[PDB]
Amino acid sequence: MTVYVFICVMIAAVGGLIFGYDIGISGGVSAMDDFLKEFFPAVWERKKHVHENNYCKYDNQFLQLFTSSLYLAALVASFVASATCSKLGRRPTMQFASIFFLIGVGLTAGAVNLVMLIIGRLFLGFGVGFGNQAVPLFLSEIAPAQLRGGLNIVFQLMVTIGILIANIVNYFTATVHPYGWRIALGGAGIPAVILLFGSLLIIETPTSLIERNKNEEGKEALRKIRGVDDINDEYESIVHACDIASQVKDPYRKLLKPASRPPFIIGMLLQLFQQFTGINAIMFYAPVLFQTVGFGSDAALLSAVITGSINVLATFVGIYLVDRTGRRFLLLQSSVHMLICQLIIGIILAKDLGVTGTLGRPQALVVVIFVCVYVMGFAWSWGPLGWLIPSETFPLETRSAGFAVAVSCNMFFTFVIAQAFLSMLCGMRSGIFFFFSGWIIVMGLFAFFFIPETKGIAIDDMRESVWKPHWFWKRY
Ligand SMILES: CC(C)CCC[C@@H](C)[C@H]1CC[C@H]2[C@@H]3CC=C4C[C@@H](OC(=O)CCC(=O)O)CC[C@]4(C)[C@H]3CC[C@]12C
Ligand SMILES: CC(C)CCC[C@@H](C)[C@H]1CC[C@H]2[C@@H]3CC=C4C[C@@H](OC(=O)CCC(=O)O)CC[C@]4(C)[C@H]3CC[C@]12C
Ligand SMILES: CC(C)CCC[C@@H](C)[C@H]1CC[C@H]2[C@@H]3CC=C4C[C@@H](OC(=O)CCC(=O)O)CC[C@]4(C)[C@H]3CC[C@]12C
Ligand SMILES: OC[C@H]1O[C@@H](O)[C@H](O)[C@@H](O)[C@@H]1O
């Protein structure tokens, strides 16, 4: 209700929007010809051919470096963020994140050198690695109870919205031949300015302030969050978190202990699976894929917007599906849902698309319809729940660190997919989709045997009615 709580919500919404923009803009810019004329002339000549050398037209490690630099940087900067928060506060790290995005935007949009372009992407990666670590800490230490899951779904919606608007910007700036990609990459500056002026107005959480000056500065800070004077009883739980100084000296061992083993294994593998489903094909190289199908320069970027629209609608209804069905059902249904689309796309590509040539109109419509359905399968299952499950399964002692490691490893696997998708496409002509399909199959089995339904179960009830009656979680 107060200004500080709503600022806390706004900073999270904008920080998701910027992350979605950086996911969606790299696909459109890469496929444009203006960008390839100024950074990658080797693959630029290969687009001059009508339909020669399919699947290997864009096989270039530095072209993929343009996409995966941000996520490598985020993986490196995630640990730095995890330390910098606990040393300085949740406000300075957000300020540094805004500064890093603002530096990266000017570097990328006004890039004159390939080294400079990759460095700008790397600075954007620093900013996003800091933000995706400070934002959960704001949301978990300012917003009141019963609003932990409601904020996670809003955050995971903002990324889809950012992807959609990034596709729109790319589609409109693709036609602009003199400086199109520069306009496309300058659009990330607006949410960065908003983040900068939002991170200046927000003050550090009382949990962070009590870590160094207990109630010397955080006592009034907690009163500003909520206008009720009944603070003293709410405080008594914040003190207990940092009471155990000897236990928090080595936070690394608590995750390895059997107390937090069950939610750790679920949390980490969820990041491994949700990235090895193969959605980053569509979020990063969708126009690149559509051009090999045989659509053309505008047709590919125009289909990308359609798939993004599907993503947004499926996410908006996925928030209701999560509230009406259990946490298990959606991940079981999704594996089948995604397996079908990947097999259909792969099977018809293996026969109708060779090393030179183009699919016919019905085949072209099929590969688009089923990829849209593929994305909608992921938007209501692994997208949101891959972050929602670790935000509730970990116990109070290992919630912050347990989620920090999840974000970091997620960034690592994203980097793997983004750096090797086109290399895999060249080496395996149509085996990328079957390679992803095998992962989806093991996802289905892992979900059916090792993830339970945790719908409406409190943290203290996780160890009684979730992992006690489970056949495999015996870590007690
Ligand atoms: C672009 C795509 C992703 C749009 C998704 C819409 C569809 C996939 C439809 C087809 C079946 C629909 C579902 C069929 C039945 C219901 C029950 C329905 O319940 C009621 O209307 C009961 C009254 C109430 O409690 O609100 C709520 C919507 C829901 C989940 C529907 C939600 C939208 C669904 C999934
Ligand atoms: C063929 C294309 C369009 C893709 C098909 C995917 C969806 C249209 C399907 C996949 C699983 C289906 C869901 C499976 C289970 C349910 C639960 C059920 O009702 C509720 O969710 C309300 C609460 C309750 O369970 O009582 C019936 C609708 C719904 C959402 C189904 C609606 C249609 C869904 C989303
Ligand atoms: C668009 C046309 C050409 C075909 C679309 C294919 C799929 C995207 C659709 C149709 C087949 C559907 C599936 C058919 C059967 C089931 C089983 C049904 O029940 C179970 O999965 C078992 C019970 C449980 O797991 O809880 C859940 C919905 C699901 C996965 C459906 C989800 C939506 C799917 C994958
Ligand atoms: O919605 C798609 C996005 O979902 C996120 O959870 C993943 O981290 C991204 O790699 C992915 O592009």
Hey, which of 164, 306, 317 would you mutate to test ligand 1's pocket, going by the most ligand atoms within 8 Å of its Cβ?
317
In ligand 3, the atom with minimum distance to the C-alpha of 328 is 26
CA angle 143, 454, 394 (to 5 degrees): 55
Method by which this entry was solved: X-ray
Of 102, 291, 92, the residue nearest 189 (C-alpha): 102
Question: Which tokens sit at 49?
Answer: 């051919």
Of 275, 228, 244, the residue nearest 75 (C-alpha): 275
**Ligand 3 center from residue 340 Cα (angstroms):** 9
| 101 in Cβ contact with 198 (< 8 Å) | no
Does ligand 3 come within 6 angstroms of the Cβ of 88?
Answer: no
Which three-class secondary structure string do you get for the chain?
Answer: CCHHHHHHHHHHHHHHHHHHHHHHHHHHHHHCHHHHHHCCHHHHHHHCCCCCCCCCCCCCHHHHHHHHHHHHHHHHHHHHHHHHHHHHCHHHHHHHHHHHHHHHHHHHHCCCCHHHHHHHHHHHHHHHHHHHHHHHHHHHHCCCCCCHHHHHHHHHHHHHHHHHHHHHHHHHHHCCCCCHHHHHHHCCHHHHHHHHHHHCCCCCCHHHHHCCCCCCCHHHHHHHHCCCCCCHHHHHHHHHHHHCCCCCCCCHHHHHCCCCHHHHHHHHHHHHHHHHCCCHHHHHHHHHHHHHHCCCHHHHHHHHHHHHHHHHHHHHHHHHHHHHCCCCHHHHHHHHHHHHHHHHHHHHHHHHCCCCCCCCHHHHHHHHHHHHHHHHHHHCCHHHHHHHCHHHHCCHHHCHHHHHHHHHHHHHHHHHHHHHHHHHHHHCCCHHHHHHHHHHHHHHHHHHHHCCCCCCCCHHHHHHHCCCCCCCCCCC
Of 145, 125, 90, the residue nearest 418 (C-alpha): 125
CATH assignment at residue 26: 1.20.1250.20
**Dihedral (CA of 214, 399, 199, 234) sign:** negative
For tokens 């372009």, the residue is 117
Question: Which tokens sit at 33?
Answer: 């010809």
Return all residues near 145 (Cβ < 8 A) that are at least 6 apart. Answer: none
Cα 389 from Cα 386, distance rounded (Å): 6
Does ligand 2 come within 6 angstroms of the Cβ of 269?
Answer: no
Q: Which ligand is nearest to the CA of 390?
A: 4
Note whether residue 474 is domain-resident: no
In ligand 2, the atom with minimum distance to the C-alpha of 380 is 35
For residue 10, the enclosing domain spans 3-465
Does ligand 3 come within 6 angstroms of the Cβ of 140?
Answer: no
| 173 in Cβ contact with 34 (< 8 Å) | no
For tokens 């696997």, the residue is 413
Note whether residue 258 is domain-resident: yes
Question: Which tokens sit at 226?
Answer: 């909520």
92 class by beta-carbon count within 10 Å (0-12 exposed, 13-18 middle, 19+ buried): middle
- CB burial of 309-318 (b: ≥16 within 10 Å; e: otherwise) equals bbbbebbeeb
Cα 440 from Cα 204, distance rounded (Å): 41
| 190 in Cβ contact with 102 (< 8 Å) | no
Question: Which tokens sit at 277?
Answer: 């489903």
Question: Which tokens sit at 382?
Answer: 């692994």
| 136 in Cβ contact with 15 (< 8 Å) | no
| 387 in Cβ contact with 324 (< 8 Å) | no
Note whether residue 470 is domain-resident: no
**How many of the other CB atoms lie within 10 Å of CB of 476?**
10
Note whether residue 383 is domain-resident: yes
| 133 in Cβ contact with 125 (< 8 Å) | no
Of 423, 369, 414, 377, the residue nearest 132 (C-alpha): 414
- The CA-to-CA distance between both ends of the chain, in Å, stands at 41
Rg (CA), the chain: 23
**Ligand 4 center from residue 383 Cα (angstroms):** 6
Of 68, 48, 52, 50, the residue nearest 60 (C-alpha): 68
Cα 13 from Cα 329, distance rounded (Å): 28
Note whether residue 328 is domain-resident: yes
Cα 28 from Cα 164, distance rounded (Å): 11
**Ligand 1 center from residue 278 Cα (angstroms):** 26
Side chain identity at residue 11, one-letter code: I
Cα–Cα separations (whole angstroms), residue 125 to 9, 68, 99, 151:
22, 9, 12, 23
| 31 in Cβ contact with 287 (< 8 Å) | yes
Note whether residue 256 is domain-resident: yes
Return all residues near 357 (Cβ < 8 A) that are at least 6 apart. Answer: 51, 54, 294
| 353 in Cβ contact with 459 (< 8 Å) | no
Note whether residue 473 is domain-resident: no
Side chain identity at residue 3, one-letter code: V
| 32 in Cβ contact with 181 (< 8 Å) | yes
**Torsion angles phi and psi, residue 126, rounded to 5:** -55, -50
Return all residues near 392 (Cβ < 8 A) that are at least 6 apart. Answer: 148, 149, 454, 459
The residue nearest atom 10 of ligand 2, judged by CA position, is 333
Q: Which ligand is nearest to the CA of 382?
A: 4
Cα 439 from Cα 428, distance rounded (Å): 16
Cα 46 from Cα 410, distance rounded (Å): 33
Q: How many domains does one find in the chain?
A: 1
Q: Which ligand is nearest to the CA of 313?
A: 1
| 289 in Cβ contact with 27 (< 8 Å) | no
Cα 171 from Cα 297, distance rounded (Å): 10
